[PDB]
């Protein structure tokens, strides 16, 4: 298995870990803030996914400093992870095309 594919897999497992810890930590950070909605684990997990993918419907979001800091980590982990898959796909195509060109 080439590096890029290995890194892709690793990036994926790591994202899953960030999502779960992010969901757990968001609840921990947000409970105690009057008005917060990111306070139960099931929807927090959903919030973590739509944040990692940067969709951000706006149905749920953190209102506290630490909830927001946790959100930033999730955003960056998602962007980085998917960005890394793109780079792996590019490498795959670059390699295949170099062969097809007989180089």
């Amino acid at each position, epitope marked *: 298995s080439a590096l890029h594919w290995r890194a892709a897999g690793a990036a994926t497992v790591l994202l899953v870990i960030v999502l779960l810890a992010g969901s*757990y930590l968001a*609840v*921990l950070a*947000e*409970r*105690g*803030a*009057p*008005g*917060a*909605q990111l*306070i*139960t*684990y*099931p929807r927090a997990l959903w919030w973590s996914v739509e944040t990692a993918t940067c969709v951000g419907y706006g149905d749920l979001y953190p209102v506290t400093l630490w909830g927001r800091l946790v959100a930033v980590v999730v955003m960056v982990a998602g962007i980085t992870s998917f960005g890394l898959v793109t780079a792996a796909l590019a490498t795959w195509f670059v390699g295949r095309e170099q062969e097809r060109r007989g180089h």
Partner: antibody
Amino acid sequence: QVQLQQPGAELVKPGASVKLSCKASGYTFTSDWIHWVKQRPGHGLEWIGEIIPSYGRANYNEKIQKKATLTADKSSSTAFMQLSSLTSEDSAVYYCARERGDGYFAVWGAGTTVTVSS
Amino acid sequence: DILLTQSPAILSVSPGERVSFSCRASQSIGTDIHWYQQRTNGSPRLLIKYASESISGIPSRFSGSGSGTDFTLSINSVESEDIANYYCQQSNRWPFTFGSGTKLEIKR
């Protein structure tokens, strides 16, 4: 089997403090929160606060005067609530309840009747 | 903080009739409402979670409905054992809050 065990009663002198206990059994998850609810005779249910034993973080009802301090003991699976400097206004049944982090109180304790008197 | 209004405070019904308890939230809370039954000198007991989802061990005559700001707890054919106080509770926003409760009376 009873998931939450609470002592039946506690007599407290005005001004004094008491530490109520809530021993939990059954399934325990890192996502569990133990809540405390106050119910005065003839009145409804009033939320006091909550605590997540897996982390030790506690939040309290901001609308009422803070009389409690929540702690938890992971090894003995027990949650505690320290009520301090009580008055007759603190006389009531205090229930502990378990929430799986999904918003509802699936199980409640039998409740401890606290009487503040001389 | 979300205010939960339970009115009327007391509901009288004849044995066997269908009864409905009202719970109105001060703002929209989706379906994050839960219902509890508390009999005289007993501790609260979960009846319905998330507005309409049934709980195991709870008689089938118990059901809930509604979304947004208005919710209903219904009992199909009330019987003596249903005599108690009924409370709604919200978990949409922090902090969780409880309604004032409605008592069920049966006119036998």
